[PDB]
Amino acid sequence: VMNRLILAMDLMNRDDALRVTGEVREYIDTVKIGYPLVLSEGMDIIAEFRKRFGCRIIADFKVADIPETNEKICRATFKAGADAIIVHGFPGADSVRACLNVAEEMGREVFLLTEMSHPGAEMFIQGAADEIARMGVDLGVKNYVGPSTRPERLSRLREIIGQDSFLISPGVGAQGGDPGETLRFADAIIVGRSIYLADNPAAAAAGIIESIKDL
Amino acid sequence: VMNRLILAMDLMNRDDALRVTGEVREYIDTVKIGYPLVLSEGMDIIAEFRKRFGCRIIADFKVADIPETNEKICRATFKAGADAIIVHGFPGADSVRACLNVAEEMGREVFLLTEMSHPGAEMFIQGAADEIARMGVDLGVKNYVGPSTRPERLSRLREIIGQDSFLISPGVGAQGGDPGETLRFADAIIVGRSIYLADNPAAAAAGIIESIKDL
Ligand SMILES: O=c1cc(O)n([C@@H]2O[C@H](COP(=O)(O)O)[C@@H](O)[C@H]2O)c(=O)[nH]1
Ligand SMILES: O=c1cc(O)n([C@@H]2O[C@H](COP(=O)(O)O)[C@@H](O)[C@H]2O)c(=O)[nH]1
Numbered sequence: 001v002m003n004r005l006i007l008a009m010d011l012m013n014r015d016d017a018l019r020v021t022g023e024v025r026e027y028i029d030t031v032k033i034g035y036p037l038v039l040s041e042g043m044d045i046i047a048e049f050r051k052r053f054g055c056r057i058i059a060d061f062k063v064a065d066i067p068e069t070n071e072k073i074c075r076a077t078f079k080a081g082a083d084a085i086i087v088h089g090f091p092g093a094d095s096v097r098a099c100l101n102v103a104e105e106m107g108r109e110v111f112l113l114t115e116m117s118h119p120g121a122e123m124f125i126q127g128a129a130d131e132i133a134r135m136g137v138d139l140g141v142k143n144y145v146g147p148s149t150r151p152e153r154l155s156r157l158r159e160i161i162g163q164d165s166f167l168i169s170p171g172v173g174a175q176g177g178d179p180g181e182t183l184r185f186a187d188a189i190i191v192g193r194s195i196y197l198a199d200n201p202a203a204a205a206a207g208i209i210e211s212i213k214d215l
Numbered sequence: 216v217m218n219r220l221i222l223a224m225d226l227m228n229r230d231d232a233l234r235v236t237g238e239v240r241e242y243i244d245t246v247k248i249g250y251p252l253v254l255s256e257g258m259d260i261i262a263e264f265r266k267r268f269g270c271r272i273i274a275d276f277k278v279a280d281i282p283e284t285n286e287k288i289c290r291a292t293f294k295a296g297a298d299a300i301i302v303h304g305f306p307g308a309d310s311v312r313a314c315l316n317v318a319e320e321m322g323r324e325v326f327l328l329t330e331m332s333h334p335g336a337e338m339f340i341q342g343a344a345d346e347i348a349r350m351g352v353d354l355g356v357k358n359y360v361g362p363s364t365r366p367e368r369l370s371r372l373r374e375i376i377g378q379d380s381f382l383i384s385p386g387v388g389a390q391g392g393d394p395g396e397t398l399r400f401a402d403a404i405i406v407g408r409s410i411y412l413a414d415n416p417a418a419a420a421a422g423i424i425e426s427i428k429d430l
Contacts, residue, residue: 012287035276036287039295042257061250062279064303066333066390068408072227072251080254088279090305092335118281120307124347128339135338175281 001188002029003209006058006168008192009033009049012040018052020201025053027205032190033082034060047081056083062113064088067098074102074110084109086145089132090125096139109143112136114157117147117171126153133160142166146186148177154185172208179208180215216403217244218424221273221383223407224248224264227255233267235416240268242420247405248297249275262296271298273383277328279303282313289317289325299324301360304347305340311354324358327351329372332362332386341368348375357381361401363392369400387423394426 007028011017017037031053033046038059050057059082063070070087077085087099089112096112103110114136115121115129136144137160146157148171158167169186171177173194182189191208198204222243226232232252246268248261253274265272274297278285285302292300302314304327311327318325329351330336330344340347351359352375361372363386373382384401386392388409397404406423413419 010284010287012291034280034284036284036291038254039258039288039291043254064277064279065249066331067335069225069249069251072225073254076227076251076254090339091331092333092338092340094333094335096335116281116306118307118309120282120309120311123307123350124305124343125307128343132339 001056003027004183004188004212005205005208006030006032006188006190007195008060008170008190009196010036010192011196012036014041014045017041017045020196021049021053023202024195024205025055027202027209028055030056030058030188032058032060043076043080050081057081058084058086058111060086062086062088063099064091065095066091067094070095070098071102074099075106078102078106078108082108084111084143086111086113088113089135090128093135093139096135096141100139100141110141111143111145111168112141113145115147115150115153117149117175117177121147129153130156130160133157137161144168145170148172148182148186148189149175151181151185154182158185179211183212183215216271218242219398219403219427220420220423221245221247221403221405222410223275223385223405224411225251225407226411227251229256229260232256232260235411236264236268238417239410239420240270242417242424243270245271245273245403247273247275258291258295265296272296273299273301273326275301277301277303278310278314279306280310282309285310285313286317289314290321293317293321293323297323299326299358301326301328303328304350305343308350308354311350311356315354315356325356326358326360326383327356328360330362330365330368332364332390332392336362344368345371345375348372352376359383360385363387363397363401363404364390366396366400369397373400394423395430398427398430
């Protein structure tokens with residue numbers, strides 16, 4: 001992705017989301033849109049963004065249902081124009097396979113979320129994360145999400161998925177993660193509040209890119 | 216809930232969803248609306264249903280993000296009129312607490328999803344489910360979701376949460392679960408395809424209720 005930086009656009013107002021995304025567009029080529037924005041403004045926001053900014057859109061819907069419901073969620077999401085969808089691995093292989101099947105049918109991609117970045121991830125997800133990543137490899141998953149807040153875990157996850165797999169990583173900035181250290185293992189970093197709550201989002205994005213280019 | 220039966224309305228078309236829900240309204244008082252319908256027709260469908268049918272609406276969004284994002288998802292969901300939201304417990308206590316805080320602020324309820332009903336739930340969720348339920352009890356959660364497909368697990372979950380807690384259970388019908396056996400442990404059953412794909416949804420609902428009344 002452009003500059004290895006993905007914007008997590010979690011503002012819940014279309015006008016503010018459009019303003020900030022437009023201000024930082026020269027620095028990115030991929031926007032992660034999740035439920036905070038979609039549940040506030042509608043699924044049409046995905047095609048609006050894709051068109052207005054010509055960016056790729058990753059729908060961060062942390063899909064985590066039974067296979068049959070996961071298939072429906074993925075079909076609705078790709079119909080709305082999303083390029084990729086983020087899926088939880090913890091509900092198991094059949095639930096992930098259902099998403100992979102719809103992505104294959106529709107010419108799109110699935111990102112598998114392994115370990116999460118927040119403190120509570122240590123309770124149950126962390127202990128299962130290596131196995132979730134191995135499950136991804138066995139299912140043919142090529143895109144993964146891992147935590148900026150725990151670079152030693154990001155390293156172990158990169159070890160499991162290999163160098164050919166694409167790995168993106170949230171938790172940079174507000175949650176404490178560092179751009180440069182995270183990019184030692186991930187291909188791209190996801191950044192939300194550090195950019196969208198900044199007094200000058202473009203300056204915040206530029207600052208991050210400068211520290212990345214130096215790597 | 217009326218007749219201890221909750222309709223899982225996972226049709227993706229507003230006209231079909233309204234038709235089926237209207238046909239079975241005399242047999243229920245609670246409709247579970249999830250992402251298949253919301254991502255296809257918009258969040259306004261929640262208030263439309265609540266108004267048209269005078270039913271309680273559980274938003275089955277399997278919330279499974281970091282605390283900050285979970286708070287935003289819950290606020291948007293309750294603003295749309297949902298009476299309750301279903302939250303995954305696998306992501307940990309801070310993520311669940313964020314949802315409980317918004318429900319307290321807005322006078323609504325949180326249902327904690329413990330073990331899931333599909334086969335893949337055996338891979339990672341089942342091994343953590345008793346602990347997820349105990350976490351719910353420690354956080355003060357009073358509403359839970361457990362699997363119709365594994366009544367021995369539903370029994371163990373009921374044992375952990377106590378008799379005062381409210382427990383609802385999906386996996387009845389299409390996934391193999393039985394109404395009567397499930398109601399030995401759960402307060403209400405969730406039924407989707409067995410009713411909404413039936414040639415006569417009202418007859419299917421009536422049939423289930425007749426077998427429930429006999430209990
Ligand atoms: O483990 C994970 C997975 C995520 O998708 N995310 C998501 O990435 C973004 C992080 O945003 P922020 O930079 O404001 O902390 C949010 O949209 C969040 O939902 C995360 O923070 N941790
Ligand atoms: O463990 C769980 C948790 C759920 O919410 N569900 C949900 O309950 C419904 C089950 O519907 P059905 O009766 O068609 O199998 C679906 O909406 C599904 O997403 C489930 O099946 N298993």
